[PDB]
Enzyme design. Structure first.
Site, PDB file in Angstrom:
ATOM      1  N   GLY A  18      10.437  16.993  -1.623  1.00 49.23           N
ATOM      2  CA  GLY A  18      11.641  16.964  -0.569  1.00 49.23           C
ATOM      3  C   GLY A  18      12.046  15.699  -0.541  1.00 49.23           C
ATOM      4  N   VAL A  19      13.287  15.403   0.461  1.00 52.29           N
ATOM      5  CA  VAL A  19      13.766  14.365   0.611  1.00 52.29           C
ATOM      6  C   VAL A  19      13.213  13.729   1.992  1.00 52.29           C
ATOM      7  CG1 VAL A  19      16.144  15.108  -0.037  1.00 52.29           C
ATOM      8  CG2 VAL A  19      15.554  15.089   2.283  1.00 52.29           C
ATOM      9  N   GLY A  20      12.992  12.253   2.155  1.00 53.36           N
ATOM     10  CA  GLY A  20      12.632  11.789   3.332  1.00 53.36           C
ATOM     11  C   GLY A  20      11.655  10.402   3.103  1.00 53.36           C
ATOM     12  N   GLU A  23      14.372  19.828  -6.656  1.00 51.48           N
ATOM     13  CA  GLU A  23      15.488  20.392  -6.401  1.00 51.48           C
ATOM     14  C   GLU A  23      16.754  19.126  -6.407  1.00 51.48           C
ATOM     15  OE1 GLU A  23      14.093  21.453  -2.364  1.00 51.48           O
ATOM     16  OE2 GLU A  23      14.613  23.350  -2.795  1.00 51.48           O
ATOM     17  N   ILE A  53       6.795  20.296   9.634  1.00 45.36           N
ATOM     18  CA  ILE A  53       6.885  19.741  11.166  1.00 45.36           C
ATOM     19  C   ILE A  53       5.433  19.461  11.629  1.00 45.36           C
ATOM     20  CG2 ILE A  53       7.344  20.611  13.542  1.00 45.36           C
ATOM     21  CD1 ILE A  53       9.713  22.037  12.335  1.00 45.36           C
ATOM     22  N   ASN A  90      15.788  22.188   9.982  1.00 41.17           N
ATOM     23  CA  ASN A  90      16.431  22.411   9.042  1.00 41.17           C
ATOM     24  C   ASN A  90      16.532  23.967   8.412  1.00 41.17           C
ATOM     25  OD1 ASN A  90      17.450  19.772   9.352  1.00 41.17           O
ATOM     26  ND2 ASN A  90      16.308  19.148   7.680  1.00 41.17           N
TER      27      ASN A  90
END
Ligand code: CL
Ligand code: CL
Ligand code: CL
Ligand code: CL
Lengths: 513, 504
Positions: free
Chosen positions: B268-270, B293, B363, B383
């Site tokens: 994932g992004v971050g 992705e 989270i 999100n």
């Protein structure tokens, strides 16, 4: 006639007790067995006796037991009675084993059924010391013909240091040919092979499990029955559920969202499934196809009539009467059924490609349509997730079916919040109870709640559910999936404390006013 | 040079305002857009303005908005400001739209990203009235060259009654060729086709989206920018997390449970992903492959250094600095990147076949390793699940990574019970925080809890978690997955009531 057609392997024949001696304290043991079919029987009985004897002398003797799915009294039952299993996976339905699990005496993890072989090969369960597999026959070139299920047997044979085979003369010889075992890389080291199944009736492999004969340490001749559970007769609740579902299928067909032959069907076992299969037998549909984990009683009739053209599964799950019907006519039914490795029957890639319709049971769902399949009050294991996740997530349509209440009305199957989640909202599109059917396609959580409460909830609980939702909508931290964390799990605690989810009129309840 | 190379289609060029008039109250609209890249910009703005005016006159004017994934202020932002979206799917990160969702003013469902196309074709969102797709160019034979993402655009073009194309001169013409669009049946009517991808670098299609030109109702010439990822570098917490993961990968390789080049990587992004990628760039694992992705900054840097051979994704998520870099060297990077339809990048059959390693944020997780990716306190959308489930469940290894606390220590990322579940225990094998790494393979729930509490929980919360677990073991209804239902969600309620999960 002789079941062991390879002469050399006849030299490995020995008594069950002797074979059981090969299994040592601490061993990881992979066995055949899935929906009460095709699990080893005599070696586990003998193992259990020796375990109890050791325990009585203060000697430890326990194994890790990895299976296809559920077994029966001779395996899970006997070993659990003996307190002989320190770890168990992936799926159990034996009551004594369930009690050991829920007491913390047996550690348990219910992996998705289609994933078990892959995780075993990755080493998640440790090194396999023993594979213990039931066979119908052993072929001239040493192939092992499975019995009433395939399960994970090929994988266990591959991984195990030593192999024990139970050749069961109770099992019909004409089972030989019904299985399709692939030598392709389905659950091995990446990159895996494409599993090229493009129709439910397609065979990709051969009729036998393969194993190096040098690993076979013992063969035991047996004669004992599978666990053919009594036919669960549909009651009026089950019939109502089936009626709503069949009406829904009918409407989808009339709206061209399903073909008149529907799509490949998967159903969990139970009287609801039985009611559905009875409805399909009488329905307007034609040329049905099964792509499931199991072959159930109601299919035999549909395969016999021609209503169903083929049924793919990993195992049989038949009553005594159905087992007799298929045994007397195995030549016919063998042409209509394909039994596959469970990592193929439950392959997400294949399930999605074929567009299966998934129909599964549940313990409970919350108003937002999250589903608990496993843990009563969140903490007490029932059976396990099984292949319900494999199918729910991969399916063209994911349907969950259940009576709207349990324990004689004292439990609501629709609750404010599920005490445990197996299937998230995204993996459940249609819910059916005897109260009606909720079609949740394209709905937000609040819209899902409106449908589930109105269509599925029992009249004794709907006002309580509506009250929770209404007050949550007003007070919840966020309003996208409204909850009141102070009372979300309170119906469960009420049941624990009082034996019912129905509120007493001796205290204030918001829905009473 | 002219972006509309089909001479005839030039006759369909019109202003954004006029194009927006094609969109009616109640319409289902499918758009391009994924990770803030390649969404339509000018038609949504014109539509929003008209919606507001309509509302003021007492006219209803709302649409259903289905995307690839996230968009930007010109689309989600403007339409949310105008109160113009009655339903939204499958993934939003715009603050204005998020506020609409969390107020109950816009209905939202965050479908698994890889499933959206199939559900659209099945009719779950209703009939598609409009497809609104951003393009870099239109080729001589009328092919539509996508921009900075592919997403669901091919499916929306297939389904929609009318099509509107925004041809954006801001987008790099050299994007043409980077996309791989398959003509096969991935998300259509069963039985679906087998997607013949057996390696992450395998192209199986062509460079253009296909659409019947008779369905093209308007083409709008636009000039506006995508969003960019932040430049900000990962801090010591993110770096510590990356350290534990990299050490874990090393040990796996040493134990022959992973190849020396690992397996195709998804993240994932971050900040944490950035830290992992930065770590991998200077790491011992060579010939890496991405099957993900998104292409992010660090992913770009490894393609540059050669440490990564190829990266497959559906979209870009680049800082302004990284965008500058790729745009200056597109000829090079174009040969190293494949942008696919999101129903292909996120196909569970392919992900499992390739044996991807999935690395996702969260989270929170509970002590049993159930993961909440989406809903703060169980009810407030952040999100969405995105592709985290597509990847977590299908992956060879499913890894979840997060700082162990949030809000200056006032929130614990490890809790007694997750307030909402996106990933069940079976879908999460490894957890990493800055406190350490929990390897849950082969473990029962009680065994999982021991590892998560002891390895991953912050020291400020660890004794509280152990206390909950120990008392649950003694007093729980069942002992297989012990809980105290009276206090399972009490840390969350404590945060709601007092602003912290720490007792007074
Ligand atoms: Cl496949
Ligand atoms: Cl949906
Ligand atoms: Cl495929
Ligand atoms: Cl595992």
């Amino acid at each position: 006639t002789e079941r062991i057609r390879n002469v050399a392997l006849r030299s490995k024949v020995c008594p069950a007790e002797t074979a059981s001696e090969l299994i040592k304290h601490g061993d990881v043991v992979g066995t055949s067995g899935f929906t009460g079919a095709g699990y080893p029987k005599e070696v586990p009985k003998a193992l259990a006796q020796r375990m109890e004897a050791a325990h009585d002398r203060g000697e430890k003797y326990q194994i890790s037991l990895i299976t296809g799915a559920s077994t029966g009294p001779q395996l899970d039952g006997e070993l659990a009675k003996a307190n002989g299993v320190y770890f168990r996976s992936p799926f159990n339905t034996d009551a004594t084993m369930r009690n050991r699990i829920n007491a913390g005496e047996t550690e348990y993890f219910d992996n998705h059924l289609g994933q078990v072989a892959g995780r075993a090969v990755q080493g998640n369960y440790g090194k396999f010391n023993i594979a213990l597999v039931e066979a119908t026959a052993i072929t001239e070139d040493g192939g092992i013909v499975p019995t009433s299920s395939v399960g994970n047997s090929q994988t266990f044979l591959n991984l195990a240091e030593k192999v024990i085979i139970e050749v069961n003369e109770w099992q019909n010889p004409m089972l030989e040919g019904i299985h399709d075992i692939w030598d392709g890389n389905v659950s091995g080291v990446p990159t895996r092979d494409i599993v090229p199944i493009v129709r439910a009736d397609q065979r990709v492999g051969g009729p036998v499990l393969r194993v190096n004969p040098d690993k076979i340490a013992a063969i035991v001749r047996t004669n004992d029955r599978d666990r053919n559970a009594p036919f669960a007769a549909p009651d009026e609740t089950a019939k109502a559920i089936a009626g709503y579902l069949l009406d829904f299928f009918g409407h989808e067909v009339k709206q061209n969202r399903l073909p008149p032959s529907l799509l490949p069907l998967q159903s969990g076992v139970g009287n609801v499934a039985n009611a559905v299969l009875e409805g399909l037998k009488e329905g307007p549909f034609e040329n049905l196809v099964g792509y499931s984990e199991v072959i159930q009683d109601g299919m035999l009739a549909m395969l016999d009539s021609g209503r169903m053209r083929i049924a793919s599964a990993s195992s049989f799950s038949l009553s005594p009467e159905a087992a007799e019907e298929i045994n007397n006519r195995m030549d016919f039914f063998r042409s209509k059924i394909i039994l596959r490795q469970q990592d193929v029957s439950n392959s997400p890639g294949i399930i999605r490609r074929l567009g299966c319709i998934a129909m599964n049971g549940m313990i409970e769902a919350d108003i937002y349509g999250n589903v608990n399949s496993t843990r009563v009050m969140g903490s007490k294991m029932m059976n396990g997730i099984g292949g319900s996740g494999d199918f729910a997530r991969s399916s063209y349509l994911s349907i969950f079916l259940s009576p709207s209440t349990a324990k004689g009305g004292k439990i609501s199957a629709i609750v404010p919040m599920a005490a445990h989640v197996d299937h998230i909202m995204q993996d459940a599109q249609i819910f059916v109870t005897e109260q009606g059917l909720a079609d949740l396609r394209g709905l937000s959580p609040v819209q899902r709640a409106r449908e589930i409460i109105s269509k599925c909830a029992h009249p004794d609980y709907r006002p309580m559910l509506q009250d929770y939702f209404d007050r949550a909508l007003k007070n919840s931290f966020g309003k996208h999936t409204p909850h009141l964390l102070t009372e979300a799990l309170s119906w469960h605690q009420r049941f624990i404390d009082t034996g019912t989810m129905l509120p007493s009129s001796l205290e204030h309840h918001h829905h009473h006013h």
